[PDB]
């Protein structure tokens, strides 16, 4: 199954208007090799890809309303590293297994702990060190603590300076 062993998890309290601002601040301040950003719909995935490219960052995106061959080839190109950011929905049955992805960002926080695990979790006891940064809104405040409890982990507030040795 999946565990959250090497994944240091943080949360940032935001409103929907502040999410793009928060993501750009994360991009600027954080030392990201590669990153995967999860959204709760394909529409929002495409809109966030547009916003990311506007801010000056290249972007990959995949979602459900796609031909599986296009999706697979885009995922292969992202694993090879042609672009450093990948925006996607929930279509990972297995845990992500890319050593270069040291930051995962839940742009839209999920409601079920199973989804949070499938986005953030790792396979085996020796996963690479990573960050998990959750953008939490008011309507997410209870699901945050509920998912934090169900999985027996802790999701701390994000500090203004994150230890570089964690990711």
């Amino acid at each position: 199954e999946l565990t959250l062993k090497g994944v240091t998890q943080y949360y940032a309290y935001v409103t929907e208007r502040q999410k793009v601002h928060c993501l750009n601040t994360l991009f600027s301040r954080l030392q990201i090799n590669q990153s995967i950003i999860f959204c709760n719909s394909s529409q929002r995935v495409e809109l966030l890809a547009k916003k990311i490219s506007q801010l000056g960052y290249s972007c990959f995106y995949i979602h459900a309303k796609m031909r599986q061959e296009h999706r697979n080839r885009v995922f292969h190109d992202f694993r090879n590293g042609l672009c450093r950011n990948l925006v996607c929905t929930d279509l990972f049955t297995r845990g992500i297994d890319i050593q270069a992805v040291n930051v995962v960002i839940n742009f839209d926080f999920p409601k079920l702990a199973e989804t949070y695990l499938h986005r953030i979790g790792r396979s085996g006891r020796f996963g690479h060190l990573g960050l998990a940064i959750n953008l939490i809104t008011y309507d997410d405040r209870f699901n945050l603590k509920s998912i934090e409890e169900q999985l027996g982990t802790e999701i701390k507030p994000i500090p203004s300076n994150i230890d570089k040795s964690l990711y």
């Binding site: 940032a12 309290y13 935001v14 750009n24 916003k51 405040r141 507030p157 203004s160």
Partner: protein, 43 residues
């Protein structure tokens, strides 16, 4: 085409965590909505 989006200042994470603590202590004592939240996020 392609626009160029820039934010003048940073997101204040300490202020955000403060707001969240205040929210918790104060709480202690379809397509229309999707389009609305999308307008708020990417407007």
């Amino acid at each position: 085409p392609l626009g160029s989006l820039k934010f003048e200042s940073d997101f204040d994470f300490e202020k955000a965590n403060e707001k969240f603590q205040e929210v918790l202590v104060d709480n202690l004592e379809d397509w229309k909505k999707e389009r609305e939240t999308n307008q708020e996020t990417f407007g």
